[PDB]
């Protein structure tokens, strides 16, 4: 059994940088997404993220909530997450907190594609910090959460599928669960 997803659906956006696109989480006036978005196809194998960050300006990020483009007015990098400051606060921001979970704990995942919610299901973090999720291409940036009364606890942001078909990602401060790095190897 997963938690009802309504409170999280209203926070999902699409983030595009050049030709690279994925999902972002829009809370108050900040959009959180995997920093992998600043890679072109050539960069994805061995990215130098500090150097790519320097090359990008605010107007190189295209953030879309449905059909509405949001203006990016600042950007910063925190571990493996990018934080995009936008000029509009999300009117559907629920009460929320960020938390880091442990192996054995379960959470709900809202799988999204190109900024649009697609399905909801429950996962468990395995002892080696991977999860056996149900994720296809385009799902990078999908989030996992629990509901604690009126409060949404965001605990997981999806980054990558590993060669054996399990999945790996970060907490909402950009720190990986497990000994992984955000590169296409």
């Amino acid at each position: 059994m997963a938690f009802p997803s309504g409170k999280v659906e209203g926070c999902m956006v699409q983030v595009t940088c050049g030709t690279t696109t994925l999902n972002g989480l829009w809370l108050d006036d900040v959009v959180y997404c995997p920093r992998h978005v600043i890679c072109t196809s050539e960069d994805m194998l061995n990215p130098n993220y500090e150097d790519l960050l320097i090359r990008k300006s605010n107007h190189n990020f295209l953030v879309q909530a449905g059909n509405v483009q949001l203006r990016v007015i600042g950007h910063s990098m925190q571990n493996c997450v990018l934080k995009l400051k936008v000029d509009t606060a999300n009117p559907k921001t629920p009460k929320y907190k960020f938390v880091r979970i442990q192996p054995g704990q379960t959470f709900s995942v809202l799988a999204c594609y190109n900024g649009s919610p697609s399905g909801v299901y429950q996962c468990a973090m395995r002892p080696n910090f991977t999860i056996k999720g149900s994720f296809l291409n385009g799902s990078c940036g999908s989030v996992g959460f629990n509901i604690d009364y009126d409060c949404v606890s965001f605990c997981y942001m999806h980054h990558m599928e590993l060669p054996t078909g399990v999945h790996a990602g970060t907490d909402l401060e950009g720190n990986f669960y497990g000994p992984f790095v955000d590169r296409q190897t």
């Binding site: 595009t16 940088c17 050049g18 030709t19 696109t21 072109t40 295209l62």
Partner: peptide, 9 residues
């Protein structure tokens, strides 16, 4: 020096 990566919607 400006990034010239083509944007695709």
């Amino acid at each position: 020096g400006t990034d010239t990566t083509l944007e695709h919607h």
